[PDB]
Structure formats: C-alpha cells, structure tokens
Subunit: 442 residues, 4 copies
C-alpha cells in the first residue's frame, strides 16, 4: 500500500517551469561540479515513483543509489523520524547516550553473519564506516598494509579514495593519498584473460601476489565488496570469497566485507556475503540501513573492536537518534514485509526480461547480479569491447520516457538496476520494458 | 523565551537510576567497549538547557552535544521542519535527483558567510567530511600538495583529518600511517608562549617564516586553522595573528581554510568566529550547529576555487540530506528570529563575569573565549603546570550535582562552557554556581 | 691477456683456514643479517676468476652482480684509479668542480640512445640514480604519481623499496613506504595467463589500467627495467617497451629506463633498450659504469633535467673523481675490446649449451651476457626454488660461483664478466649442466 | 709534511683559460641546476690547498664539506687505494666477502661510543646510512614514527629529504615525501624565544610535544645531529642531548646520532656525542670516514642491527674494498697524527681570532662550534635579524683573495669553517685574516 499514485506519467516536456526555476537558483550557489543525473527536482518520493515539482511521475530504478530500499517514504520510517525528533535531535552518544543507538546496535549484532561475539559502532557515512573498519584492523593487528581490489569503490575521503580503484571522478587531482594501500586483481569472470579460471584459482592468484608483494603477516586487512558496486556490479566467481576468507584467518589478517551498497536485503539475503556463507571479521554498512537518513555502521568481532582504546573511535553526529529511529523502523519493514523475498522475486522477474532481450540480440555482453542489485554490461557488436556511448544513450533515452535509471562501471558501460524493494511488479515490468525498448532503439 | 520541559536542575536520589542501568547493561553486550560516554545517564528528552534522563532526573546542559544544539536539542521550528520534510521523501541523493532543500541551505550559507565575493557551497554529512573536501578543493584548485595545520588543532577522525589533528591520544594512536604532505606549525597560544610579550603579528611571522623555510609559500595548497581551537582547549589567538596569515596566504596563492565546525553559527556572538577580526576565508568548513542536531556539514568558499573541481569530483550518497536541510533552514531561521548572536554575547558577559569573580579568589590559570564558547584553563597552585586531575574531578563533581559539563585541551586541563544559546540566565547562573563551588571544593 | 691464471682450481675443502679466520672475525662485528652467498674471502679477482685467501680459484659467473663487466681488475681501470687518487680523492663537485665529472658526463651523452639534447648528473649508487630520476620527473612534469611494474627491483632506499615489487628481503618491516607509487602488470611471457598474448596487447593492458586507476595526465613517470634483473631476467614480449614509450610521449609522462643492471654492454648493445630502439626520456645507470668503483648516473632530456633548480640535485661524494677516472677507463675498455661483441658471443655460446641441456627447465631467456634459466617442478610450470638453491650450492662446491634470482626464487642467472674466456665460460656451463642433472 | 706548496697564491684573474675551457664543456652536458660554489677546476688538492688547472693555489677551508679531514691526498690513503685497486675493485660483499669490509667494521666498533655489543653495516653515501638506520629502527621496534628536528639536514633521497627541514634547494618540487616523519623543536640557543632556557628544559619541550603529538611508544627513532651542519652549525645547549637519550631509552625508542658531518675527529673528539658522553643506539657515518672515497656506515647495538632478517640491509657497491682500504688508512692517520688534538688546536686558534673580530665590531651575532667545525652567524647591525647578503658577499670576497670558504644555515647567514685537520697554523691564520678583512670590508 502506497501514498502516491504508482505509475509512470510524464505530462509534456521537462524540466518543467518549477524545475527550471530551481536550476536557475542552483547555478548561483552550488559548486558547478556538483551535477545531478536527473534535471527534474523531487517533491515527493514513494514506492517506485519520483514525482517532480511540475507533477511528472518517473519510475525510480535507482533508489538513491541503493539507499531507499524500503522506499523513500516508508510510513514506519516517517513516523519514527517524526516521533524521535520531538524528544531530542542530538546529544552526541559519546557525551550523553541514548536507547536508539544501543537498539540499532542490537539489531545489527543479530542480523549480521556469524554467531561469534560481535560489537558495533555507528557513524554517518559509508566512507566513515570504511575508515573506521580500517582503523580497527590496523590497531587490532598492529600492522599497516591494507589490500583493496581492482574495480573497488569505497568512498571519497582521502583513505577511501586511496582504497578506491577508479580515478575519474573520484581521485583525479585530490591526492597525495593515504599510504600503505595495495591493489590486487579481482575475480571478474566476464573479463578474465583466461575465461576458464576458477574462483579458487583467482583467489590463489591474489593470495600469491599479496604474499610476494607485501607478505601475509604484514597485512592489517583485506577489504572487498562481495558485489562490487560502482565498479560495475561485478560478482566474483564462486569460491573466491571463501578462499580469501580462509587465508585471511590463517594469516591473522582482518577480512572486511564492504556491504555499504549490497547490505540490508538488497541481494535477496540480509548481506551479500550470505550467498556464499562467508563470515567477515568486520562488515561495513550504510546506504540502506536507515531508510534514507544518514547512518552508517561497522559490526565486527568483539575481540577486534574492543581492542580500541577508550575514545578511539567516534564522531559528533554519529548514530544520530533520529537516524537510529529510522533504522529500527527500516529494519522492521524489511522483516515484516519480507524484503529479502521481494528482492529474490525482483531478480526472477528482471533477469527473465533481460535474458529475453539477450535472446533477441549483439550489444549485451553480460547479465549479472543478485536480488535487487542487477546489471547488464553493454559491449560493442560482436566483441567484448566496452560500449559507454550506448550506455550513456540508453540512460538518457530511459529518462526521456519517464524512467530514472543509473549507470556504473570501470569502463562506463554497465546499466544497473537498483529499484526500491517495495516496487510493484507492474511498475518494475513497465520500467524494464522501457529499458529494453531503449537498448533496441540504440 | 519559552520551553517545552521544566527548566530547572533536579536530581531525585542516586544515578544512574534503574532504567539507565538497564540500558548500560544492554549496551555492554553490543557496543564496542572503547565507545565511552562522559555521562552515565540516558537521555529521554533534551530541551532548552536541560537533559532529562529516563529516570526523570533533570541535568543542566552546558555542552550542547559538543556545540551542536545551539538552537536547543528540540527547537519547535527544527522539529516541525524535520517532521514535514520526512513525510515527502527521506533521501534521493542530490547527485542523482536534486531538490530544493539543498539549494536553499546553499543560498543561506552564501548569504551568511563572510565576504561579498562570488561564493559557492557543497554539502556533506560530517565535519570531517567537510574538512576533507576543503582540502580536496585546495589541492585541485592550486595544483599543490602541502597543507599546513597547527599545534593544538583538531579537525576529525578520518585518516587525513587525523593527520591534520595534533593530539595523538585518543584520536590517532595506532590508527596510522597518516595521509601525506601535512605539516604542523606553531600556534598563537598566549597563555603558554615562551615569550609572554609576543604579539599576534609576531606569532604569525614566526609561523610564516617556518612555513617558508620548511615548505615554501608557493608549495602550500592550504593553511587550515580554527579561529578558536576547540578540542585543543578553546585557544584564542592573539589579535593580529589571523589577519597576518590571511594576508600572506593571499600573497602566496595559498587557500586559507577557516575550520568553523565548532565556532560557526552564532556560537561566538557573531555568525562566524572570523567575523570578530574581519578575516574573510577562502574556504570555510561547517557542521555541528548548522542543522540543529541533524547530520549536515558544508564547505562554502570562493567560486573560482570550488568551481574548478571537475564534474562528479566532490560528493557522497547521503550528503545534504533533505530532512537535515529542512532542519538547517529552520535552525538558521531561529538564529535570526531570536537573535542568537545577541544571546551568545549576553552569555559571554554573564559567564565571564562569574568566572572572573572566581579567579579573584591559585588554580585558575586563564579565562578565555567568546560568546557561548568560553573556557577556564586550570593549573597547579602557584605555577603554570597543567592540572588534568582537578579538571577530571571538577567535571565529575559537577555531574554529581546535576550539571553536565565538558572538558578539553592538549593537556587535558581545560573546562569548557558550550551551553545552548537558548539557555536562560537563571539556569546558566545555577550551572556556573555549581561549577565555581566544584572548583573551590577540589 | 690476464693477470692471474684463468683456470678453475679448488684445493681440498673450503672455506680454508684464512677464510674461516675472517668469518670468525666477521661475526663479532658485522650485522648478523648481512649474509654472503659465498663462504670464501677474495684476495684477487681478475678475468673470470675469484681467488680466495686460501689460494682457491673459482669461476666468476656473477661479476659482482653485473658490476665488473670489464673485469674486477682491468689494467686500464686500475691505472686510472691509481693515477687519479694521487692528485685528489674528493673535492665535492658542487663546491670545487673537476674534469673527470665533466668527461664522464660527455661519454654518457654520447653513448646513450637518441640524438636529442641530453644532460647528466652523477651520484654514487643505483638507488640514488633512481631516486634522482624520479625527483626530476616529478619536478619537471609537476605531477606526483610514478608507475612501476610487477617483478621490478629498483633499490633499498625508502622510495626505491616502494618502487620494488618483491617484499622478501627488500621491504618486509621497513615501511611505511613513499607515497604515490602504483604497480602495473608486466609482460612476462612464460607466466602469462593467456600464453598467446602479444607485447602490444600486454602494453595495452598496462595502459588501460594506468589510465583507469591514475589517469595518464596524472603520472609523472613510468619506470621499467628493459630486462628485469632481480625479478628473474624477465624479457618483455617484443612491442611492449615501444608501446609504453609511445604512450608516455603522448601523455607527457617521463619514461625512465632503469639500466643499472642491463647497461654498458651487458646485453650485447650499449643499453638494453637499443635491442628494440626505444629512446628513454631519462635513463638510470650504475653497476657496470665504473668498473667496480662506486658511481651512478642519470642521463636524460635537457629540457627535463635543466628544469631542476640550482642545488636541487646533488650529494657529497657523487661523481667521485677516482670513480670517474675508473668510468672513463672502463668505457674505453668497452670500446677498445668490443665488449658488446664479446657479450653477443657469450650469448651464442651460453644459450647454445643451455638449450642442449633440454622436465625441470621451464624457460631460457636473456640477451648477451645477461642470461637466465627458470627452473620449474617436473612436468609443470610450478616454481622450483629448492632445485635452484641446490644447484647454486652444487656449483659452488665444484668451484663455480653462480647467482640466483627471481620473484619465485627459481631463476639461475648468468652474469659473467664480458672479458671471460670461452674456455672458462664452457667449463662453468659444464659444471652448471652437471649440477642440474645431479638434482 | 706535504706534497704541494702550502701557500696562498693567486696569479691574476680567474677562472683562467683552462678552467673556462672546462666550464664551456660542462654547460653542454651537465644539468644546468648542478652549480658549483667555486668557478675554478681542481688539478691537485693537498694539505690546506686546492690548486686549480691554471696553477692558482686557494686555501681550502671547506675540506669538501667536511670530507677530506685527513687531507685530499693523504699519502697513506693514496697508497692504500692504489694497492687495493690492483687486487680487485669490487666483488659485492653480499656475494663474495673480503677482509677490508670486516676490518673497517672492526675499527668502527672500537672507535664509536659505548662498551656494549655493537655491529656495523656499510654503504656508500650518508643518505644511504641514514636510510638504513631508520630501516633498522623501524624493524627492530615494530613502530612507524621517526622524529627529526628543526634545522636538520639528513640527505637528498625521498626519506632523507623528508627528514631534512629546509625546503630550498633540498626539497622543493621533489615530493610527496615518505610518511610518518614528525618534526620537533631544536635547542638553538642564539634564537630561543626565551634566552634563559636550559638544555634540560629544551629537551622537556621536545619530549612533551612528542608525547602529546605521537606518543613515546609510537616512535621508532629520534634522529638528531649532535652539531647540526647545513642547518648552521647549531650546537644544542648542554643537557639537551642526554635528556633525549635518557628518554629514548625509557620509551624503547632508537636514538640515532647523525654524525655524517661531525664524525671522525672533526669536533676534537672521535664523535661529537663524546663531548657530552652520550651513547647513541645507532650512529650514522660518512664524509670523513674514508678520506674522500665513497663510503658510509651505520654502527649500533647488536640486538637492533641483528634483528634485521637475512638480506634485509645491503646494496651493490656498499663497503667497496678500495674505499675500505682508504678508510683504514684514514683512521690510521687520524690516530698516528692525533687529529683530535689538531682539531682542538684549530678550535683554540680560530675561535681566538674570531672573538678578536667580535670585540672590534655589530654584525657578528654568534660564534659557536667545536674543534674544526666552527661557525660565525652574521646578523644585521644592532639586531638579531639574519644577514644573508653579508654572508654571500663575504664568501665571494674571500674567494676573490684566494680563500675557498663555505656558508650554510636555515637563514643563509652562517659562515662555516671546515678546514682539513692537517692544515698548518700558518695557512689557517692566513685564511682567518682574509675572512676577518672581508667581514670588515662589508
Ligand atoms: C556508496 C559507497 C560507499 C561510501 O558511502 P557514502 O555513504 O557515500 O560515504 C562505500 N563503499 C561502498 C561499497 C559504496 O557503494
Ligand atoms: C568536531 C570537530 C570536527 C569534526 O566533526 P565531526 O562531524 O565530529 O566529524 C572538525 N573540526 C572541528 C574544528 C571540530 O570541533
Ligand atoms: C642493483 C639494482 C639497483 C640498485 O643499485 P644499487 O647501486 O645497489 O643501489 C637499481 N635498479 C636495478 C634495476 C638494479 O639491478
Ligand atoms: C652531508 C650530510 C648527509 C648526506 O650525506 P651524502 O653522502 O651527501 O648523502 C647526511 N647527514 C648529514 C648530517 C650531512 O651533513
């Protein structure tokens, strides 16, 4: 059940007058480099719809980059936020604590993988979460080196930029970057030089390289996204992640799962790592956790997190009570409405339609992902060469028909589906039809 | 002025009470042990100058969540704005689908920050993100690497902001290695200058020569300084220091960054601490008080600098969250409607009056600050040696009587007053009386 | 014509009494970690022979890690050093200059690739050369990033460690390392995941990765050894080095050829890059340059090197006059006796015998007097470090000092002095062949 | 007893024809930035004379920046080099070892301070020596941070540049620099803001700062020159350090004495540290060690150096046998001719003449140093402001009269005397007379 009409409706040209008026105001005061993928301005966002200030209704297939999984205005989230703000907006947990922080903390302990003792700390952004996961690995192990992977993305702070692989736009001219970060090869099936390579073998390749170029006993942490987001929704070959996990344990290296984008039901399991039963030492969370409010978290082994000295990890706003209220409600919605199930259903529907399209066409190089985190990598006809032009064009074409869809990828040639999990089959199918028509059209 | 909950200090028997204890017991199973709180009671409602715990005790709030809830922890306007905004949409990510709130907050910061030159703004979540982004801009726009920070600086808990931060315990220990090309220079700290007669101008010349000799003016991307150093101990530089640095920075093409995360938005009796001396920073970093307790941060600076950054270079998922933006617009509005600059100046007159009365009856080394950002540095009797023991003891003694007061300082020996600006004279005086009694008692 | 008898001769067991006496002294005073590959102590070294203090004569197939290419006591070098030391040992070129520095500088300008305007600065070690090449690239381009490759080795200072790939023993526990160094995939034919990959294709793989992970316009320098030394005498596929060079020029990136080990006739050309006609923007030199004396150099484009401010590049000892005298003589010997030719001849002989030896032999590669055999496990490509250690020991036992190397510790390398006789080289190769068969 | 006539003798204008011919050759082939302080080219250098290719004889008051302490062609050194080179030039100690290395190693063990177990490794340059000291400290302690001081100079590699304080010309545009280097205040009596400050107090200032900004238990090494060379022959106040040494021992910090310039009799003791009886954990050596040949060394505690793994420390050329021969002879000369005594005698003579000059004048700010490492810091008349113009001019004036004298200093205003220790009283006095005349003249 939804608040605004759940269907695609574009009345004439856009941006309309009220959107244009905002754009004109914007350019006087927001940095020129801060661009938006969409030229219309939101007034209301709900279910699978973004409704602009000129009354146009777009299908939302991005969920704010995997954030509003429960929907951009889930009643429970809205109510919780409204109620919490009336009591106190902020007291800073490090100064005067409050139940909401503890309570979110309890849920994450429960929902994250593994049955060992775990603890949590809360912050605001994904980047802060990753920063803190690395702080903990480094202090707990007494080591320096952190290994990250090709096609990784972990944020826009200096260290998270360091950890991030792609330079444009995330890194160019922003260095020099945090030291002792090393990059290793990813398991990226569609582009392996030897297509027959196994997950285990891909892991062994990474492991040998780490051992030879750093040494296992010198690495504080291995950080990897179980499904690489901005890198192009790269899913590693079966057996890769477990091999890295096993080896990390052998060598006393903290294995950090970055589930900022893949976490909270997005992939059809609570965490992406659940697909293969990998149990990370620390896991970083944000985006979907708090139904749109700014919250992030690390949850990991008690012995690691409890190693940090008093006052070592923190922040002013972190674990904001209004955001915490949002999170508790968001997680509750995830359970009450079985969003894991909705995500699995979305996979079945969307991959169905996409494979139909593959069978008609060829520009469709690879279809991959899980749950509500799906992607199609577009290539040049009859080869594997990347096709960024087609990708840019298809996104624009979709936008023209009233479908907001996101792109990504190291080579700028991956269309990604990140719909809110509460999206109706009707709307999703409509969106997928527009997408399929766009690809055919170009 | 008028409030929601009774504005009186009221402690019913021993605390933490039962409901607080229950929360502490829950907390220790799930929150990392290093995340400590200064206060053992759990908030239920925070309003005006009072923190009311879950067991019905009412403490005087002389910390405002570390300078965050300047307008109060539940300002009706803020609360209303948050409630209203959340009902429309919690998040769409400005970089994907933009929205008025972002632009509007951006318009206000342009207007309220110093200088009449062309300015632009980008929004993020935390103070650390803000400082990170200022440095990104300075580095890209100047084409240089080096950033100078000062003794007693504090700028955050990410890797770079830790690098910029001076004090190692607890902010840095075992969390490195730290981001490169950060250089540290001597601060103007009157009370501890080896030559007590030194002038602000002379202190600036000392810093400038050192920068020139050890980096070179044309090699420095940015000088970053807090006009009043917060965690460092509410250090106010001698008159003439900040302008000298500013003038020189302009000479050498160096971006002068004012970190006003803690001192900004009326805290000091002016909109920004730099306004006391009429310094006009090239970029200024903001958070804490900006959004009445919601998680928001900002950089506002010269258009030519910020606009230099390439499309997509600066950003974040949550940044400039719409619910937070609503909160900021309301918070800023309250600051104007109720003349919080005036309230801050009044707080100064009152608080410095009572503190100087106490000095006049020695363990009180220095009284300093301005507006609602005031401090007393405690020393050993009859010398200038730091007295952390007395500082810890006074904070504890205050808490016991129902007054939550914060401490700070490089040497752990500074009591700081950061009351909310909406505090009543009655409550402030009560708090100051408790403070004065506590110092005398120990 | 040689000074000491050019015959392999081991009298009984070693280390002998005088060597043992030195080892006993050594352990009281030299750091324990500083180990030597050979347990005997040199008294005289000449031609292809190392003669120890107990009168044993070993065949020298390492030339001090590619240093004594002209021989460990070339008469010309010896005479020049003796003469120069009598006038002055040192005045520091940055204070009071002298002809020797300028002269060495003239020769390097002449002998290095390319006809464009070039300039030179001198230092002491290979690591100092590389450090200075990077300083110049960074200042001239105004950029930060430097790319190095898998299997690279460039030295033991903090930055050169950073540039170096292998952690044991060069890096472990010695960091944190100099920032803004990025590592890219090498063209290593024998271990390519796709054995059919081309040099051009391997270069494209590296280039795309650089572009995507740094950006061409952000890179101050690409640094590569034309033949990777300590990494295992890895020779890249034809077309790789020129592609990188072309691209570097396109993007304003300084292309640094690290020829510290491969330079000065070692590969049968003056510089390894000459095999493919690549013309580096800066080239780093040491080892062979001064016939054993401590000297190093960078030689590169005038417009790059001249960009550095007065006093920016230097050092106290750098371009030492005694070492310069040695270099001029060494280079002279290289020409007078056509050591390039001797090197090409050593290749023909050595590669001949090594190919006859062919299973435990994975790959035979190299050029001139810089040759190698990579040993694997029988019937696979898995590395065989055990066999490699054992063969080196077996050769030592028979009076042949031979060096090993490689990322996986499984490469036997031939680095004989270029003045070695065919008789001695064949003898050494026979001992090597016998040792491999033996294990 | 000497080889060439020990008298100052300039025949007409210079550079003469043969020098000019070399300059013309030079400019075609040496980088333009590589400048020389002296426009004439050496043919022979012996005793206290540099004789150029046009037959002019200059007094040498620089000894090649403190290198040719035994003289630029000491017969013993010359003979030893000649003999050694005939046997073998190089075999690489790590491959085939040799007596010369071991022997030099024995002497350094014997001559360095302390009676504890010591070990040595050899390299080529001073920078390599410092690099290796730091490698050992870092591995042996398991820590990262290295503290260096204001006015320090340690070399021109990336890390030694990092350690070095002054940017022009050593650092400008050559970064980014090696991470985890921290800079602390030096004891520099002449420029202390509080002139009455004590060495012990100065050390306490540095120590507190280290403790507060890094933490004692986080520092791998403290590296300091007992007399700072290029920084301006700064001698710390008595008691400085010993206090640093005592504290380093308490905190498990490796204390590195950089004696590359001050070592081997230069100050009138074998090492500058011997003046105050400080016993460093590692000591770095080069310059004077091998009478002009390229050699350097670290000598330190067995337990520290032996901690390094096999193959960890090394180099190709390091401990070159011809250089080793030189060193043994050079050390032998130092003993046979009591160069410590000669240095002490030089001090008495030179400081005598310099203080006479101070009495006549005022432009002479400070006279300091020990042994044959002496300096006069020149200031503006009647103040402490630096006088780089006078300094440049005096050096030029001296050169004109046939005296080659070096300058140095953070502020470019220090004339330094680094004569070879084998210089005759007659020549030294002549040189000092020219110097005194030059200062008076300008
Ligand atoms: C979005 C993202 C981040 C950074 O999160 P922010 O909240 O934008 O700081 C980090 N890691 C991954 C894997 C992400 O997808
Ligand atoms: C609190 C503080 C910061 C960091 O802000 P967070 O939001 O706590 O990351 C930065 N700068 C100053 C001056 C501060 O007081
Ligand atoms: C040996 C080596 C160096 C280091 O030279 P040193 O003089 O030992 O510092 C640098 N680069 C390469 C390619 C080498 O083989
Ligand atoms: C000259 C100097 C060095 C550097 O030695 P080089 O051989 O020139 O690398 C190091 N330390 C000190 C104290 C010096 O004066």
């Amino acid at each position: 059940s939804y608040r605004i009409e759940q269907k695609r409706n574009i009345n004439g040209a856009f941006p309309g007058p009220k959107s244009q008026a905002l754009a004109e105001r914007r350019s006087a005061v927001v940095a020129a480099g801060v661009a938006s993928g969409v030229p219309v301005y939101v007034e209301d966002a709900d279910g699978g719809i973004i409704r602009d200030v000129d009354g146009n209704s777009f299908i939302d297939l991005g969920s704010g980059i995997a954030v509003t999984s429960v929907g951009a205005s889930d009643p429970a989230v809205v109510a919780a936020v409204q109620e919490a703000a009336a009591h106190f907006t902020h007291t800073c947990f490090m100064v005067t604590p409050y139940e909401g922080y503890v309570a979110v903390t309890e849920q994450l302990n429960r929902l994250t993988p593994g049955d060992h003792a775990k603890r949590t700390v809360l912050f605001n952004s994904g980047a802060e979460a990753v920063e803190n996961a690395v702080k903990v690995a480094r202090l707990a192990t007494g080591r320096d080196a952190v290994v990250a992977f090709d096609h990784a993305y972990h944020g826009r702070t200096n260290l998270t930029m360091a950890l991030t692989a792609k330079a444009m736009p995330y890194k160019t001219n922003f260095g020099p970057f945090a030291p002792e970060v090393y990059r290793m090869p990813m398991s990226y099936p569609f582009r392996e030089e030897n297509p027959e390579i196994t997950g285990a073998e891909a892991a062994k390749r990474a492991i040998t390289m780490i051992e030879k170029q750093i040494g296992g006993d010198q690495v504080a942490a291995i950080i990897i996204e179980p499904i690489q987001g901005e890198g192009g929704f790269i899913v590693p070959a079966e057996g890769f992640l477990p091999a890295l996990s096993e080896w990390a344990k052998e060598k006393g290296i903290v294995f950090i799962a970055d589930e900022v984008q893949s976490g909270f039901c997005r992939t059809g399991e609570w965490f992406a790592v659940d697909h293969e039963g990998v149990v990370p030492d620390i896991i970083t969370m944000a985006k979907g956790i708090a139904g749109g409010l700014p919250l992030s978290a690390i949850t990991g082994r008690a012995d690691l997190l409890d190693a940090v000295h008093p006052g070592g990890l923190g922040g002013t706003y972190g674990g904001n009570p209004v955001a915490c209220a949002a999170a508790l409600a968001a997680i509750d919605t995830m359970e009450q409405h079985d969003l894991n199930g909705r995500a699995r259903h979305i996979e079945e529907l969307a991959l169905g339609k996409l494979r139909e399209l593959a069978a008609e066409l060829s520009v469709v190089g690879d279809i991959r992902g899980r749950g509500a985190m799906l992607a199609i990598e577009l290539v040049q006809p009859g080869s594997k060469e990347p096709n960024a032009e087609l990708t840019k064009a298809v996104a624009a074409a979709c936008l023209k028909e009233g479908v907001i869809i996101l792109t990504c990828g190291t080579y700028g040639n991956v269309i990604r589906l990140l719909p809110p999990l509460v999206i109706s089959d009707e709307l999703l199918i409509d969106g997928l039809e527009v997408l399929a028509a766009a690809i055919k059209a170009h």
